[PDB]
Amino acid sequence: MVLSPADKTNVEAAWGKVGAHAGEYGAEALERMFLSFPTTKTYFPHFDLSHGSAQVEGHGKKVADALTNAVAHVDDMPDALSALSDLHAHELRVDPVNFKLLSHCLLVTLAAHLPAEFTPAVHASLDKFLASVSTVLTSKY
Amino acid sequence: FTEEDKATITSLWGKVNVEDAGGETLGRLLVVYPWTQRFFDSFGNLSSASAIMGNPKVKAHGKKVLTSLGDAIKHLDDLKGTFAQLSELHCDKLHVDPENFKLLGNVLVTVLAIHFGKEFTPEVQASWQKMVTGVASALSSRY
Numbered sequence A: 001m002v003l004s005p006a007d008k009t010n011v012e013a014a015w016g017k018v019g020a021h022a023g024e025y026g027a028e029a030l031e032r033m034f035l036s037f038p039t040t041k042t043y044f045p046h047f048d049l050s051h052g053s054a055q056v057e058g059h060g061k062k063v064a065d066a067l068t069n070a071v072a073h074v075d076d077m078p079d080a081l082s083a084l085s086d087l088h089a090h091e092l093r094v095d096p097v098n099f100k101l102l103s104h105c106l107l108v109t110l111a112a113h114l115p116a117e118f119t120p121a122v123h124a125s126l127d128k129f130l131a132s133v134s135t136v137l138t139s140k141y
Numbered sequence B: 001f002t003e004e005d006k007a008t009i010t011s012l013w014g015k016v017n018v019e020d021a022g023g024e025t026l027g028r029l030l031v032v033y034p035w036t037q038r039f040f041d042s043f044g045n046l047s048s049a050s051a052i053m054g055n056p057k058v059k060a061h062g063k064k065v066l067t068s069l070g071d072a073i074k075h076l077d078d079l080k081g082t083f084a085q086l087s088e089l090h091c092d093k094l095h096v097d098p099e100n101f102k103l104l105g106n107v108l109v110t111v112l113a114i115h116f117g118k119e120f121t122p123e124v125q126a127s128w129q130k131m132v133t134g135v136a137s138a139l140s141s142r143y
C-alpha cells in the first residue's frame, strides 16, 4: 500500500515502542502463524518448530530486525529490501498468501502486548506498512 | 472444530463484553479497510478514525454482528446452516465482496488480543482462526 506521512510517523512511533522486544515479538508471531496456519510450516522443513525452539527464536529476531530496517527506510523500501526480495521471491517462491498470514500474526502479537499503543489509526498504518513490505518481498524487480 | 476448539471458543466468549468488542471490531474494520465505509453511509460521518470509533450507529451495529457470532457458537458444527440467510442478505441485497468477511474476522481476532493480552495465547488464537475461517466460509456459501 502507499503510505501517507501520517502512516510513516505512526509506524515509526509504534515500532519504536516495540523497541528491545522486537525479537521477542517476531518469534511469537512466527509461533502464532505456525499453529494457526499449519501450511506455512512447509517452508521450514529443516526447523524445529516446537514451542521455545532455538531456531524459531533466532528466526524471529531476524524477521524483527528486518522490519526495524524497513521502518528506517520507509521512503525507499524496494531498494532497502532488494536482497530480502531476492530470497523470498526468487529463491523460496513464497506464495503471497503467507505474507498476509504472518502480517496478521504480527498485528495480533502487537495487540496482545501493546494494547494502549495499538490504536485503530496505528493498526491501520501498521497494516499498510506490512502490506507494503509484503509487496516488495513478493516482487521480482 | 476439535472438541478443544469448541471449549476454547465457548470459554473465551463467556468473558467477552459483546457491546465493547462489537463496536471496537466494526470500528476497526472501517478504519483499517476504509472501502468498507461505503456499505455504512447511512451511519453518518465516517471521514476520520476518531469519527468512526465514536459513532453510535457503528457501535450499535457492531454489537449486532458480534451477537450473531455469539449465537452461532451454540451451533459450531452447523455454521453453514446458521448463516445461510445472512449469506443471502450480504450477497444479494448488500453486495459485500466475500473477501471482506475474512477481514472482519481478522479484526475480531486482533480485538480479542487487545482485550485478553497474554491470555490470548497462540493456542487460543488457533481455535479462533478456525472460528473466523468457518464464519467467513458460511457467509460466503450462498455466493
Ligand code: HEM
Residues within 6 Å of the ligand: A040, A043, A044, A059, A062, A063, A066, A067, A084, A087, A088, A092, A094, A098, A099, A102, A130, A133, A134, A137
Ligand atoms: C514481513 C515479512 C517477512 C520478513 C521481514 C522476513 C524476513 C526474513 C529474513 C530477515 C530472513 C533471513 C534472510 C537471510 O538470512 O538472508 C528470512 C528468511 C526466511 N523466510 Fe522470511 N520474512 C518474512 C516473511 C516470510 C514468510 C511469510 C515466509 C513463509 C511462510 C518466510 C519464509 C522464510 C524462510 C523459509 C526463510 C529461510 C529460513 C532459514 O533457512 O533459516 N518469510 N526472512
Ligand code: HEM
Residues within 6 Å of the ligand: B036, B039, B040, B042, B061, B064, B065, B066, B068, B069, B086, B090, B094, B096, B100, B101, B104, B105, B135, B136, B139
Ligand atoms: C463475521 C462477519 C459478519 C457477520 C456475522 C455479519 C452479521 C450481520 C448482521 C447480523 C446483520 C443484521 C441483519 C438484520 O438486521 O437482519 C448485518 C447487516 C449488515 N451487514 Fe454484516 N456481518 C458480517 C460481515 C459484514 C461485512 C464484512 C460487511 C461490509 C464490509 C457487512 C455489511 C453489512 C451491512 C451494510 C448491513 C446492513 C446494515 C444496516 O444498514 O442496517 N457485514 N450483518
